[PDB]
Amino acid sequence: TNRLVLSGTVCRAPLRKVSPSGIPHCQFVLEHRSVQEEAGFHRQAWCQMPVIVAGHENQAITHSITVGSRITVQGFISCHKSKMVLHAEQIELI
Amino acid sequence: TNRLVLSGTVCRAPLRKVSPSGIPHCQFVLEHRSVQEEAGFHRQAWCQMPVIVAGHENQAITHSITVGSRITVQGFISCHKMVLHAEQIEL
């Protein structure tokens, strides 16, 4: 299983490219901040998560995303060298 | 929402630690590798995720895990470098 569901405020606006083969993709950064319960106590959770939205079907929604937009992204995490990226599969606005 | 569900092989053996205040928790590293669909193509996904297990109710499970154990962990992520704060662990 590889499923991350993460809500946050967009802190870098989408940058958009099309691969040579014609695959559209845009990248932005998603800032999450919340209070989470852990072992009966509350702790602040925070992350700036890079998000990639690849493929034709999810591009239209990304044009409503700007810095300040509140969204939830559901997808899978991928790590390179150690930088992480959330690869979006569903995006919910507000 | 802040929910990560991630399966993998333990690649660093669990250690049982204490906070400055003396609060116990267990930690290990989880190596994930999978094949995911993206834009109609198959793409490899990998991550080595540090995991924190602070619930004492999870101590029996975390003691049966060694390097090589296959597990699924669910919890919330926080960036301190990312760490998965485990709420459930399934063997």
| A83, A69 contact by CB (below 8 A) | no
Domain boundaries, chain B: 1-91
Report residue A89 as tokens: 């599969």
- Smallest Cβ–Cβ distance between B45 and the set A25, A45, A78 belongs to A78
Q: Which residues pair with A12 in a beta bridge?
A: A29
Q: How far apart are CA B76 and CA A74, in angstroms?
A: 14
- Smallest Cβ–Cβ distance between A55 and the set B40, B72, B81 belongs to B40
Amino acid making up residue A2: N
Experimental method of this PDB entry: X-ray
Give the mutation candidate from A32, A38, A49, A83 for the B interface (greatest B CB count, under 10 A): A38
Q: Which residues of B touch A72 (CB under 8 A)?
A: 1
Q: How far apart are CA A43 and CA A61, in angstroms?
A: 32
Task: Note the resolution in Å, 1 decimal.
Answer: 2.0
- CATH class as words, domain B1-91: mainly beta
Q: Which DSSP category does B58 fall into? A: G
Report residue A92 as tokens: 């919910």
- Smallest Cβ–Cβ distance between A6 and the set B1, B47, B87 belongs to B1
Q: What are φ and ψ of residue B19, in 5° steps?
A: -65, 170
Q: Which DSSP category does A4 fall into? A: E
- Contact residues of B toward A, CB < 8 A: 1-7, 25, 32, 34, 36, 38-40, 43, 45-48, 54-56, 72, 76-79, 81-82, 85, 87
- CATH class as words, domain A1-94: mainly beta
β-bridge pairing B82-90 and B70-79: antiparallel
Other Cβ atoms less than 10 A from the Cβ of A73: the count is: 27
Q: Strand runs (DSSP E) across chain A, as ranges?
A: 2-18, 24-38, 41-54, 70-80, 83-93
Collapsed DSSP state (helix, strand, coil) of residue B31: strand
